[PDB]
Design a protein around this ligand. Structure first.
Ligand SMILES: *[C@@H]1O[C@H](CO)[C@@H](O[C@@H]2O[C@H](CO)[C@@H](O[C@@H]3O[C@H](CO)[C@@H](O)[C@H](O[C@H]4O[C@H](CO)[C@@H](O)[C@H](O)[C@@H]4O[C@H]4O[C@H](CO)[C@@H](O)[C@H](O)[C@@H]4O)[C@@H]3O)[C@H](O)[C@H]2NC(C)=O)[C@H](O)[C@H]1NC(C)=O
Ligand SMILES: *[C@@H]1O[C@H](CO)[C@@H](O[C@@H]2O[C@H](CO)[C@@H](O[C@@H]3O[C@H](CO)[C@@H](O)[C@H](O[C@H]4O[C@H](CO)[C@@H](O)[C@H](O)[C@@H]4O[C@H]4O[C@H](CO)[C@@H](O)[C@H](O)[C@@H]4O)[C@@H]3O)[C@H](O)[C@H]2NC(C)=O)[C@H](O)[C@H]1NC(C)=O
Ligand code: FAD
Ligand code: FAD
Ligand SMILES: *[C@@H]1O[C@H](CO)[C@@H](O[C@@H]2O[C@H](CO)[C@@H](O)[C@H](O)[C@H]2NC(C)=O)[C@H](O)[C@H]1NC(C)=O
Ligand SMILES: *[C@@H]1O[C@H](CO)[C@@H](O[C@@H]2O[C@H](CO)[C@@H](O)[C@H](O)[C@H]2NC(C)=O)[C@H](O)[C@H]1NC(C)=O
Ligand code: NAG
Ligand code: NAG
Ligand code: NAG
Ligand code: NAG
Lengths: 587, 587
């Protein structure tokens, strides 16, 4: 990594709210994150469309290594670029922190840069199970390829374990992708891990952009040729910020959507934005207001605007405009870490990802886990609804059956074991397919206080705890197994904190105390049929409203066995097309 | 509590940075918290003194119950009024959150409202040991009384356990103080606790405003007659915000102090403030720049400005202007909670505080603890300096000896067991007098990124851990002892998480995993002689600089066996007098 030249984009953007207050744009986008900027860029390709992006943070892509270098991952946490949202006290009786980016590019500023794609069956379920017409793998694959420009791996990258299936990578898109390569010798552990699991009959070197992410592979990252993080601002704003029809207001928060009443429901006419209950401004949209503030916030903006569950709104003292199941169905994953020291021979760079299916994760407990899936769905659905994770047991059962189908019938990756080397055998791992459903709701009426109860309800579903415990056990087992054993130089985490012969039950206890949110919450404004409990339709329009869409990570109706940037970019592009279709239909 | 109609002070304050950018004020106060507002109010009593307060947050005193009602304590955590600073990963390998207020009044907006005063010997040591002229109990007692307007407890409050030594309470000051009374029947547990410890020879009903806070008493709160939290904005800004010479810029952060080089060192000439590396402005001070951004932030502002330890500034890429031990010596306390359910008879409202001295805290381990204090000071001092908590072992040993003196010779309260009732026997407790010394340093040069390493170094000193373990055991033991037993309905925390017969060693392991910061960090810019490692002198001037003072919680050179609002108000008043003395000397 070399700190190259960075355009000071911020100095050409707006930071004075009085410059936009009371103005009228075609579209107002709340949140200049992944989806917000993608859509902003696509909308402003048409010179007649004036778009205002209101972003809480600022331009941070020129911050140097802490943002630009993928290898500095994590150092930005705790800075002003980290939203650092606080959850309610979780199952272990501690609040947890939600990492999320604050600044143009949102969480793409601070993420791990892992570039993989969901399983075809997961995206197909959006159309086939959730009724979202056109949201299927074939369509999304095209949009996902359209978003990226992949570079093929070098010889050393291939030898380290990379495997590139050229049919799955777009080569002409906006977001560059390629193998992370920090200049260090390649650790042999990625290959060792592949050799270990391939001896168990686990697929290896499947290209994770191809539709069936399974087994152990090295992955692409969203890095340019200079190994610079291609956050969404760099990809979509940097090239386009001089467009006169694209206005970016930084340092300001959208608090609520402004509506006018029509015969066909509330029509969004603008937003109230600002920084405080007494420092806020109205700004108007001729066409639509697009919420792209991230899955933790977009539901809140709706609730602050009077759209949400009456029970939530009443408690918050917000007059209800529309009853919609906003802020429920939220699905984040639980992450645990199993870390071991690698021998000197195992030193070097490299990450490998193991997308373990149901049986690989559960191993000898597979039969028992299968029995639970086959018999407890109704009970789990009832309990999830009872704790406020969802509102319609029948509709939730559909989701559970969908996940069950994936896990037992479709060989979908259940757990992701993310291995980092750099002198260790470090596994960050998470059960990808939670049965728990969480909630994210406002607690009071002033949007600028941002008083919310963000409750992912981790491990309130027993299967998620078992799944995480089994995945964690698997990481430990894999580390001192087969070819991996050669490089194993002692476990440090849990290390002495958990007996080496730990059973699934002991791992469960350990995991309950030592997990963190995966910070990949989705489905807080679920895009699914209204009858299934959706908040937004297939064009991301909030049901019962006009001129209002939620276009971010709040809308995926399911978790995916993948890193979400790819699908979110594809989703943002698809939604931009829908918005533009509507624009064209108004003359 | 009853929500009354509140004045919208925010609308009369500044939120546009362009309105102050480039102006010259007499004084610029970075941080409109407890000390910042107190000083700003005192300085602007003189109509010719133009003061600018730059506050990161806004006016929040009219937010309703979440701020105004002391009984809503903690609901504000996680909102925009909570700084929610992240520490580095602590001894338990978890980062922890630092609650701190963000808005006019700072942490007085979100605090527990406990109004108690330090021990006379602790304040006397500032002058006697640390060499800070005029900083002694007699002087501070008067200043502390001048800040407050106390109400005597009612008959019911007295019968519940209140006790007042009228000679210690100011009755004409600005911050009202009185018994919290939420209208509920008084729990009998405060009296039961007093009866329990009084059987053991522990003092009860000592007035904790009188100089020797010891034993179990009920305490005053900073509440007006309407039971409204008297935060510092309410007390000092609300009455005075129409002053034409008092300008408050909200929503902006001071990032660094601007200096002009003189013969006698750097002269502060103003500050750079704003919200981002590319969105910031300069504003100038004719007289002085006063840092009052809180003990977690003032040291950082100095470091961002080039004042601090070379090793820190080099790592952060900040050119050093002055080498001073900024951001070390930091002392926060560790808090643990021992919570038990109370029988129905113990129901009701009421808080009681046990200021436990050394022997009461350690009980049977007293002899062993005393041995540690008598023999390990030098070792601890070396180890504290080695881990970066301080820079001069000899000077640190002075602090250690001072603390040892307090504990062993002066009967100073060593641990505070803060009891809440309301259906429980809930003890939040902390060792008040830490031997550990933490650090708080910038990690990079952009102030607006706020990339820092806030490291309280909790439990890196063995005595602190022992002290916290012993205090925690004491809380458990007291709960089911003597008169307390009647109301004891079973422990819930640690409850099953720690065996009921837990030894001190088992408590230590427990405490290590289950503690939180007390959020009372002081001494990050210690007010002590330069030779002892001071950052500011007895008039709060940063050594080696002109026109620059640190006037907040960063400056107390020692922890105090008390809630700090009282002493911080007293300190701010004393510092205001020092500032005005200098103002007068410049014509
Ligand atoms: C906070 O986090 C830090 C950092 O992670 C924790 O500190 C690390 O703690 C781990 C232990 O949990 C420790 O790892 C040991 O390192 C030793 C080298 O100094 C190794 O000898 C040791 O290996 C043995 O134990 C492993 C774990 O059980 C086995 O996997 C391994 O094969 C080894 O087992 C052999 O030896 C043991 C002797 O204990 C014997 O009983 C076995 O049967 C077998 O013969 C560990 O790998 C790290 O060195 C620590 N330090 C750092 C910086 O990493 C700290 O514990 C955490 N604190 C809390 C409160 O959680
Ligand atoms: C997260 O926090 C929640 C909330 O605090 C935790 O849930 C609470 O957990 C505690 C236990 O740790 C539990 O308290 C028990 O409640 C029971 C009633 O429901 C009581 O019967 C029980 O009392 C016995 O145990 C206490 C603790 O040891 C003793 O102090 C007490 O005297 C009792 O012990 C006597 O009785 C038993 C048999 O009854 C005997 O064997 C003993 O030797 C002795 O004679 C506890 O008070 C709370 O009910 C839980 N729930 C709530 C809502 O508070 C949760 O565990 C935490 N989660 C994690 C992961 O840490
Ligand atoms: C720690 C972490 C690691 C991750 N690692 C990976 C990875 O390795 N691979 C991967 O593919 N994905 C990863 N992700 C996920 C990916 O970054 C997110 O899914 C993606 O950025 C979500 O896009 P979005 O548009 O939904 O929201 P975001 O990108 O979060 O953007 C939302 C934007 O809204 C702004 N905002 C918030 N509130 C308001 C308001 N009230 N008004 C105006 N603006 C507001 C925020 O500042 C932000 O810029 C990671 C995310 C995190 C947090
Ligand atoms: C959770 C909690 C509970 C507490 N309970 C009690 C109690 O019960 N009794 C008691 O006596 N004390 C209590 N305190 C302690 C008391 O509230 C604090 O000690 C006191 O407010 C510290 O005053 P200060 O002036 O140092 O800083 P603060 O009051 O914190 O004020 C600092 C101010 O600076 C602002 N600021 C921060 N960074 C910047 C920047 N870069 N530029 C401009 N402004 C900035 C902050 O927004 C804030 O308003 C508690 C504190 C906390 C956090
Ligand atoms: C999960 O993938 C495994 C491959 O790793 C699938 O195949 C079975 O693998 C298990 C152990 O890994 C073996 O016991 C079986 O013998 C394998 N099958 C055959 C035909 O050999 C397994 O089917 C996948 N699970 C699901 C639910 O799809
Ligand atoms: C801690 O306070 C205890 C009281 O709980 C002190 O003990 C009393 O000390 C006085 C002497 O000043 C004696 O007259 C009493 O008989 C003592 N006995 C007890 C156990 O009550 C104790 O001295 C204090 N400890 C320190 C270190 O000051
Ligand atoms: C290659 O990609 C195609 C889709 O284009 C997919 O069908 C096939 O399974 C992929 N193979 C591997 C090994 O990734
Ligand atoms: C509950 O969800 C099921 C499945 O979508 C649906 O058939 C039913 O209409 C929903 N119930 C109501 C009353 O909406
Ligand atoms: C009463 O307060 C005075 C200080 O004003 C103090 O000197 C005296 O000791 C106090 N009395 C008791 C009993 O604490
Ligand atoms: C170390 O501290 C001691 C005690 O204050 C002092 O005498 C000595 O001068 C200090 N520092 C230096 C620079 O040596």
């Amino acid at each position: 990594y070399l700190p190259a030249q960075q355009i000071d984009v911020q100095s050409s953007l707006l930071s004075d709210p009085s410059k936009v207050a009371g103005k009228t744009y075609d579209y107002i986008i709340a949140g200049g994150g992944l989806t917000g900027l993608t859509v902003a860029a696509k909308l402003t390709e048409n010179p007649k469309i004036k778009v205002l992006v209101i972003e809480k943070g600022f331009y941070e892509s020129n911050d140097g290594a802490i943002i630009e270098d993928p290898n500095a991952y994590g150092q930005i946490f705790g800075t002003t670029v980290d939203q650092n949202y606080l959850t309610v006290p979780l199952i272990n009786n501690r609040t947890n922190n939600i990492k999320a980016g604050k600044g143009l590019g949102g969480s793409t500023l601070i993420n791990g840069d892992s570039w993989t794609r969901p399983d075809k069956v997961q995206i197909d379920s959006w159309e086939k199970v959730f009724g979202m017409e056109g949201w299927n793998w074939d369509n999304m694959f095209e949009y996902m390829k359209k978003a990226e420009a992949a570079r093929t791996p070098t010889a050393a990258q291939l030898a380290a374990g990379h495997s590139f299936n050229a049919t799955c990578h777009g080569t002409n898109g906006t977001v560059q992708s390629g193998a992370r390569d920090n200049g260090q010798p390649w650790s042999p552990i990625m290959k060792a891990l592949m050799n270990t699991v391939s001896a168990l009959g686990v697929p290896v070197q499947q290209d994770f952009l191809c539709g069936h992410p399974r087994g152990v592979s090295m992955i692409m990252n969203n890095l340019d040729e200079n190994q610079v993080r291609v956050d969404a601002a760099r990809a979509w704003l940097l090239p386009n910020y001089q467009r006169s029809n694209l206005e970016i207001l930084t340092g300001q928060m959208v608090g609520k959507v402004l509506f006018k009443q029509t015969a066909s429901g509330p029509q969004a006419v603008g937003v109230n934005f600002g920084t405080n209950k007494a420092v806020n401004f109205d700004v108007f949209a001729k066409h639509e207001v697009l919420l792209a503030a991230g899955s933790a916030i977009s539901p809140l903006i709706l609730e602050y605007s009077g759209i949400g569950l009456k029970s939530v709104l009443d408690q918050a003292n917000v007059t209800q405009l529309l009853d919609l199941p906003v802020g429920i169905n939220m699905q984040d994953q639980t992450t645990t870490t199993v870390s071991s020291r690698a021998s000197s021979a195992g030193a070097g760079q490299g990450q490998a990802v193991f997308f373990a299916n149901f049986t690989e994760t559960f191993g000898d407990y597979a039969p028992q886990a299968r029995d639970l899936l086959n018999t407890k769905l109704d009970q789990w659905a009832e309990e999830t609804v009872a704790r406020g994770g969802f509102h319609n047991v029948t509709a939730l059962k559909v989701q559970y059956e969908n996940y069950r189908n994936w896990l037992l019938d479709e060989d979908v990756a259940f757990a992701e074991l993310f291995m980092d080397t750099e002198g260790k055998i470090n596994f960050d791992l998470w059960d990808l397919i939670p049965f728990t459903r969480g909630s994210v709701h406002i607690l009071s009426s002033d949007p600028y206080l941002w008083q919310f109860a963000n409750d992912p309800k981790f491990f309130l579903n027993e299967f998620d705890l078992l799944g995480q415990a089994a995945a964690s056990k698997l990481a430990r087992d894999l580390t001192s197994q087969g070819a991996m054993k050669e490089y194993f130089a002692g476990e440090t985490l849990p290390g002495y904190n958990l007996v080496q012969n730990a059973t699934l039950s002991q791992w469960s206890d350990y995991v309950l105390q030592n997990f963190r949110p995966n910070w990949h919450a989705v489905s807080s404004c679920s895009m699914m049929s209204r009858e299934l409990g959706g908040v937004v339709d297939a064009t991301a329009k909030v049901y019962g409203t006009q001129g209002l869409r939620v276009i971010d990570g709040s809308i995926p109706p399911t978790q995916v066995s993948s890193h979400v940037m790819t699908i979110f970019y594809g989703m943002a592009l698809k939604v931009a097309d829908a918005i533009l279709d509507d624009y064209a239909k108004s003359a």
